Amino acid sequence: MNKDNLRSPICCILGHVATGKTKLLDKIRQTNVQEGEAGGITQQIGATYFPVEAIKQKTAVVNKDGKFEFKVPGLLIIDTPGHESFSNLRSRGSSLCNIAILVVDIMHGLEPQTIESLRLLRERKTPFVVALNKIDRLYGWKKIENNGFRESFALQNKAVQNEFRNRLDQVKLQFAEQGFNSELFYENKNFARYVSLVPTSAHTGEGIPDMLKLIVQLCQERMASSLMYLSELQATVLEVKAIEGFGVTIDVILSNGILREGDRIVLCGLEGPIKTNIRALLTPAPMRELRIKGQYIHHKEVKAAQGVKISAPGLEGAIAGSRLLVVGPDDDEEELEEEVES
């Protein structure tokens, strides 16, 4: 359990259309992905890597005394489409994650794809918190940019505080009807068993510090302890696409283990196993999206979890969703081809 064998866990963001999943991530990243999107909607799985240094800075306003202990090296956050036509991608993102944020519009409560998401979460026993987003839409909300929720909530007028309590109670009742007990996050005395509700605004940043602290807490206090450390390689192909200068590449979620430039890799292809070597192992800059076209950073080595793009010859027939394996010293290359096909 050395700190040079720590693993960055995977957090999926799930929720109904237009609840603010991408906008929340844009506020954390300081990006404008949502503005860029056709229709303002997400149509693919996105991956952004957050080094723990950034998480520490973005939670300082709810950790002023420094007493919160950070143990993760970072977190890979997966953005997903809420639109009904992409249930396959919510399913894939859910299958990949270790923990999750379920985004609910506080003004609307639970909606059809919230219910779909809750089924995914319950089935896989995924620890999650709920972001009750768009609190700035409470009428008369007075913002302090990027504040902790409690601090800001204390400064609101009586009308706003009453409206919040009323909507919060309604949402709690909705979750209870779906079989989930939930509590406002600082009122939750059973983090292991009850869902924490953290009110947020993607527009003002309020509550995001609380939300980030909570997902680190999910990693450190709910996720299986073994997942804090790197073990055997696990990787999944997300997409296959030709990129200028690199030929047909694959975007991969590295879920566990370590990938290296030059690795002999095996994966499923249309006509049978593909066996090739990694020519370039690419990532976005930290806190930038895998689903966004850009210049890429080349790495000799990438430790899990991360979203990577791999350049290699012979990827033309790669199958999205395929597992990916690396040929190790004690492996037989053909035997490994047979194992990936399984």
Ligand SMILES: Nc1nc2c(ncn2[C@@H]2O[C@H](COP(=O)(O)OP(=O)(O)OP(O)(O)=S)[C@@H](O)[C@H]2O)c(=O)[nH]1
């Ligand atoms: N006022 C306010 N508006 C918000 C907030 N969060 C998101 N929005 C707005 O809601 C709209 C939808 O946000 P978006 O980030 O696209 O949702 P999404 O959950 O990613 O939606 P999808 O990709 O599943 S279709 C956008 O216009 C965005 O500006 C918020 O906290 N306050």
Ligand SMILES: [Cl-]
């Ligand atoms: Cl949970």
Ligand SMILES: [Mg+2]
């Ligand atoms: Mg989106």
